[PDB]
């Protein structure tokens, strides 16, 4: 009867960011707010698995979030491992979402570069994770192409 | 090249009259100039899934096995994980073609979060998909039919 | 600065190919020295999983050997190793160059033939390694497409890391 409002977390992985370089965690607060949905809960977090991983469930125990959305600490060296972190908390992870990330970027962003590209989405109970890379540019293509087109279907399948 | 399929439509509520998926399947395969020489019809759960695949595998002509439905992201859609755990080996590059060819030609964005697993167990080969017939055809038309002859042909030198 | 030299091995992975019949080997050394890149390792190891592990260790152990690539013994049957057994090596799987590689190639050369292609990219240590498929024409896409556009940048981030 209306367009579902989704309600998120955003989650911010760095440990250089501030509330006042954080272009990556408005970005996603202002693709949010347009498309008619609502960000409860935000937050900066350092770096590392177990911090992720406590803003992820965090976010999964608010009564006022049905989605966490998180960006940064991806990438191809030993000390990037969102991905890892991510991957160990979900129920069933939603495969699609990397998988077309990668393609699209390629195809209309990025290209070869693509290739080095992480992200994964999934769910924990009746809620939603997804993790992109921390550039914004990143953050726009996922969000436009993939998730923002999605959100309202995920969630009601999930609720019911 | 005549291969034999056995055709599993995974649901609790299709019947011989309501299955669309499984019927598109036969129309499919026929016409390729293939055959058909199992159908069934089984319950929506991991067990009845396996079970129906493994059945397929130990019928002497049979050499590949179609399912669709029982896909999805929620709790109870476990035709994936079902299958992938008979699997000898994936072929990965089903699923991903699946959902590239998906979203580039069809359902768009809705192709994140479509599920298909495909892979061999012995000499045959197993390919798994969704359950609408929009699903079944594209799967069958863009990279299965195509490929049947060729993947038997391999498995069984 | 200036164009990288990166410094490669090549693994052929097979139980006939022979130095002069090595048209896959030939082919990845010809690319990388256009490109401006230079090959310290080369040797045809036989067809096995412990053969093919084997190989890639000892290129990863070579001083002067920053990037494996291998080619050959994939497949969808039983005795198609190469895949899994890099894979057991690898600390990190770069999936993007599996993925792409058959997205490539299902809409540039071989259509719905790629969904049986295989091909693994990852890390060990700071150094990176790729197989891919033996046939000349999956080398060359592999290469043009996705590592030789990126061979530079990947050894950069991971001689930082």
């Not at 600490?73 to 699609?96: F, N, P």
């Not at 990397?98 to 570069?113: K, N, P, T, V, W």
């Not at 290739?115 to 994964?120: G, P």
């Not at 550039?135 to 399948?157: C, D, Q, Y």
């Given at each position: 009867?209306?367009p579902?409002?989704?309600?998120?977390?955003?989650?911010?992985?760095?440990?250089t960011?501030?509330?006042?370089?954080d272009k990556?965690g408005?970005?996603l607060?202002?693709l949010?707010?347009?498309?008619?949905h609502?960000?409860?809960?935000?937050?900066?977090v350092?770096?590392?698995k177990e911090?992720?991983?406590?803003?992820?469930?965090?976010?999964?125990?608010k009564?006022?979030?049905?989605?966490?959305?998180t960006?940064?600490?991806?990438g191809?060296?030993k000390?990037?491992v969102?991905?890892?972190?991510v991957?160990?908390?979900?129920?069933?992870?939603?495969?699609?979402?990397?998988?077309?990330?990668?393609?699209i970027?390629?195809?209309?962003?990025?290209?070869?570069?693509?290739?080095?590209?992480?992200?994964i989405?999934?769910?924990?109970?009746?809620?939603?994770?997804?993790?992109?890379?921390?550039?914004?540019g990143?953050?726009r293509?996922?969000?436009?192409?993939?998730i923002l087109?999605?959100?309202?279907?995920?969630?009601?399948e999930?609720?019911?």
């Amino acid at each position: 009867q209306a367009p579902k409002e989704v309600r998120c977390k955003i989650v911010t992985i760095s440990d250089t960011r501030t509330e006042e370089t954080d272009k990556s965690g408005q970005l996603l607060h202002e693709l949010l707010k347009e498309a008619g949905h609502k960000v409860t809960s935000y937050e900066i977090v350092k770096d590392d698995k177990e911090s992720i991983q406590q803003a992820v469930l965090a976010g999964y125990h608010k009564e006022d979030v049905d989605v966490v959305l998180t960006n940064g600490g991806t990438g191809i060296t030993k000390r990037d491992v969102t991905i890892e972190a991510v991957s160990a908390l979900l129920d069933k992870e939603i495969v699609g979402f990397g998988e077309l990330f990668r393609m699209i970027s390629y195809l209309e962003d990025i290209g070869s570069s693509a290739m080095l590209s992480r992200a994964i989405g999934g769910t924990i109970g009746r809620k939603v994770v997804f993790s992109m890379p921390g550039s914004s540019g990143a953050v726009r293509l996922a969000m436009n192409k993939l998730i923002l087109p999605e959100l309202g279907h995920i969630t009601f399948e999930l609720h019911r």
